[PDB]
Amino acid sequence: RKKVLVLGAGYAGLQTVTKLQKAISTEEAEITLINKNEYHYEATWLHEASAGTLNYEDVLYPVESVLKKDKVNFVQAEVTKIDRDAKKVETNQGIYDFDILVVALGFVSETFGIEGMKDHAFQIENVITARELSRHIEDKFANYAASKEKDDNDLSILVGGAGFTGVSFLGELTDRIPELCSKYGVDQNKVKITCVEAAPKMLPMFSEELVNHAVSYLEDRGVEFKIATPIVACNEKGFVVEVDGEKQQLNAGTSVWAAGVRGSKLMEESFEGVKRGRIVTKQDLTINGYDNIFVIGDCSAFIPAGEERPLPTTAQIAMQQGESVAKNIKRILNGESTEEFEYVDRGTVCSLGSHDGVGMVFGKPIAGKKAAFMKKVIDTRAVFKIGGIGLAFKKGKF
Ligand SMILES: Cc1cc2nc3c(=O)[nH]c(=O)nc-3n(C[C@H](O)[C@H](O)[C@H](O)COP(=O)(O)OP(=O)(O)OC[C@H]3O[C@@H](n4cnc5c(N)ncnc54)[C@H](O)[C@@H]3O)c2cc1C
Numbered sequence: 001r002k003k004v005l006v007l008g009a010g011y012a013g014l015q016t017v018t019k020l021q022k023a024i025s026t027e028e029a030e031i032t033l034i035n036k037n038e039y040h041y042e043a044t045w046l047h048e049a050s051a052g053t054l055n056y057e058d059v060l061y062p063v064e065s066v067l068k069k070d071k072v073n074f075v076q077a078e079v080t081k082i083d084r085d086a087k088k089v090e091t092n093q094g095i096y097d098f099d100i101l102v103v104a105l106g107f108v109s110e111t112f113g114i115e116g117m118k119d120h121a122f123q124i125e126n127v128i129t130a131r132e133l134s135r136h137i138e139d140k141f142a143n144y145a146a147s148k149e150k151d152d153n154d155l156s157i158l159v160g161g162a163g164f165t166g167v168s169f170l171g172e173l174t175d176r177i178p179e180l181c182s183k184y185g186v187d188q189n190k191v192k193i194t195c196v197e198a199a200p201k202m203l204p205m206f207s208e209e210l211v212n213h214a215v216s217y218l219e220d221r222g223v224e225f226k227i228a229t230p231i232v233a234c235n236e237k238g239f240v241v242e243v244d245g246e247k248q249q250l251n252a253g254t255s256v257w258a259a260g261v262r263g264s265k266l267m268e269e270s271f272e273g274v275k276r277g278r279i280v281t282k283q284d285l286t287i288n289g290y291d292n293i294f295v296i297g298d299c300s301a302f303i304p305a306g307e308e309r310p311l312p313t314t315a316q317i318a319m320q321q322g323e324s325v326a327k328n329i330k331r332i333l334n335g336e337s338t339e340e341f342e343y344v345d346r347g348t349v350c351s352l353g354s355h356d357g358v359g360m361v362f363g364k365p366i367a368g369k370k371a372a373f374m375k376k377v378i379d380t381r382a383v384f385k386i387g388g389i390g391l392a393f394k395k396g397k398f
Contacts, residue, residue: 001026001027001028001029001030002028002029002030002099002100002333003029003030003032003097003098003099003100004020004029004030004031004032004098004099004100004102004329005032005034005089005096005097005098005100005101005102006031006032006033006034006102006104007034007079007082007089007101007102007103007104007105008034008035008103008104008105008106008264008297009033009034009035009037009040009063009074009104010040010043010104010105010106010297010318011043011297011315011318011319011322011382011386012104012106012296012297012298012299012318012319012321012322013033013035013102013104013105013296013297013322014033014040014063014066014322014386015318015319015321015322015323015326015385015386016102016104016294016296016322016323016325016326016329017031017033017067017072017326018066018067018386018387019322019323019326019327020325020326020329020330021067021068021071021072022068023326023327023330024071024329024330024333026070026071028333029071029100029329029333030071030073031071031072031073032072032073032075032096032098033063033067033072033073033074033075034075034077034079034089034091034096035063035074035075035076035077036076036077036078037063037076037127038062038063038064038076039060039061039062039063039127040060040061040062040063040066040386041059041060041126041127042059042060042379042382042383043106043107043126043315044315044379044382045059045379046059046124046125046126046127046129046130047124047165047168047169047171047172047351048172049127049130049131049134050122050124050129050130050133050134050169050172050256051134051137051169051172051173051175051176052134052135052137052138052176053172053175053176053354056127056130056131056134058395059127059130060127061383061387061391061394061395065387065391066386066387066388066391075091075093075096076093077091077092077093077094078091078092078093079091079105079266080092081266081269081270082101082103082266082269082270084101084270084271084290084293087099087101089101098292099292100292100293100294100329100332101292101293101294102293102294102295102296102325102329103264103266103267103270103293103294103295103296103299104295104296104297104299104318104322105263105264105266105267105297105298105299106263106264106297106298106299107125107261107262107263107264107277107297107298107299107313108123108125108261108262108263108264108265108277109123109124109125109257109260109261109262110260110261110262110276111257111260112259112260114231114232114233114234115232115233115234116233116234116235117160117231117233117234117257118257119234120234120235120236120255121160121234121255121256121257122136122254122255122256122257123256123257124165124169124256124257124258133254133256136254137157137176137180137254138180140154140155140253140254141155141180141181141183141184141186142184144184144186145184145185145186152190152191152192153251153252153253154253155186155190155191155192155253156191156192156193156194156238156251156252156253156254157173157177157191157192157193157194157252157253157254157255157256158194158196158238158239158250158252158254158255158256159173159193159194159195159196159256159258160196160197160231160234160239160255160256160257160258160259161195161196161197161257161258161259161260162195162196162197162199162202162203162225162227163197163199163202163203163204163258163259164203164205164350165258165261166195166197166258166259167202167203167214167218167350167352168350168351169256169258170193170195170218170223171217171218171350171351171352171353171356171357172351172353173193173223174193174218174221174222174223174353175353175354177191177193177222188222191222192222192224192252193222193223193224194223194224194225194226194250194252195218195223195224195225195226195227196226196227196229196231196239196241196250197225197226197227197228197229197259198228198229198230198231198259199227199228200227200228201227202214202215202225202227203350203358205312206350206358206359206360206365207365209365210358210359210360210365210367211358213358213367214350214352214358217352217353217356218352226241229241229242229243230242231259232247234255234257237249237251237252238250238251238252238255239252239255261298261313262276262277262278262298263276263277263278263279263298263299263300264277264298264299265277267279267295267299271287271295272288272289273288275301277298277299278298278299278300278301278310278313279295279299279300279301280301280302280303280310281294281295281296281300281301281302283305283340283341284324284328284338284339284340284341285300285302285321285324285325285328285341286338292332294325294328294329296318296321296322296324296325297313297317297318297321297322298313298318300321302317302321302341302343304342304343305340311343314348315382316345316346316348317343319382319385319386320341320343320344321341324339324341327339346361347359347360347361347362347363348360348361348378349361349366349371349372349374349375349378351371351372351375352371352372353372354372355368355369355372356368356369356371356372357371357372357374357375358371359371359374359375361374375397376396376397376398379396379397380392380396380397380398383395383396384396
């Protein structure tokens, strides 16, 4: 009975387990799933939980509810060390041995060595960061309303990055901010929402026509964009940016970083050839020198056969990688060879509030209500693909 140890119960990790548990026999292998929290959270919905347009409990479900418990041991613990050669994983709740390992430990914020960006800004990482940020935003409207002398800077919000995560967040803020203005007695004209992006283009994965749609939607709803503008620091007051190479202080009571992510810090400590918590895997999703270790999700850099650059970090690729790993573990267990991973680009949608969005679905571009609808299908399909129709019914977007 070989030991299959899965690290992380995210999109990649939990998908590997819920597929594998259907395939193997109790005599074939023993599965162990280690996760920090008792729940699985929908990281792709953290823009809503962070803005406060959704209750945090709606973006998560208990891990054990989708497990076949005669085949999987759920361990709630934090992975502290991974010994690739000794075949051991240390946690705050004990050491666990392995025959096969699946590293699916996800991502964390990456601030590109920008001084004060982790300390003085709120990140978009998990349910705990989301809860802290939505409460902070509302507390700023509440404290503003409470003060006799009103500082309109308490209501100024800075968002670092105009990519997928940045735009999704701005979209939720445009639904939330009017509601808080009305509740706390504030005029919307006093609220300032500024998106700063160092790159020369916003949402670089989409057409100019789709980006023009996103920009017009957010600009009409009070967002100002400062693109191709580097963020050289973050302090108590807000961000320090360069404009024509001249440092300028931008003030804001809330500074949110959404411009970069990296794989788990455990990656550099545990494996060789790691660049910002990502490891370039072999085509079957194993790592160089270890036919018994798989690294998937945001901890991986899968370069497709014909190409040179790795595919981007997404929950879509993560889930597809987990389905691959589950089949290849069964093949390994039965003395068979592994098959290569082939990513199927079904397209995606960046939300723009509750009733809008920009995306590519079936290879054709989509916007507005059709995008909002398809975003609910993609989000509900991801609950379905891990836990089935009942969980999709209970926790989906329909
Ligand atoms: C707001 C937002 C919107 C996004 N929208 C999209 C979208 O529309 N489509 C899309 O495809 N992608 C989207 N993404 C990207 C997507 O969320 C990630 O690529 C995805 O989360 C990667 O899944 P994963 O399994 O690798 O990691 P994760 O989702 O990060 O899960 C890792 C799990 O491991 C646990 N863990 C981490 N470290 C430890 C440790 N040391 N010990 C134990 N447990 C640990 C975590 O608690 C978590 O349960 C978005 C991301 C964000 C933040």
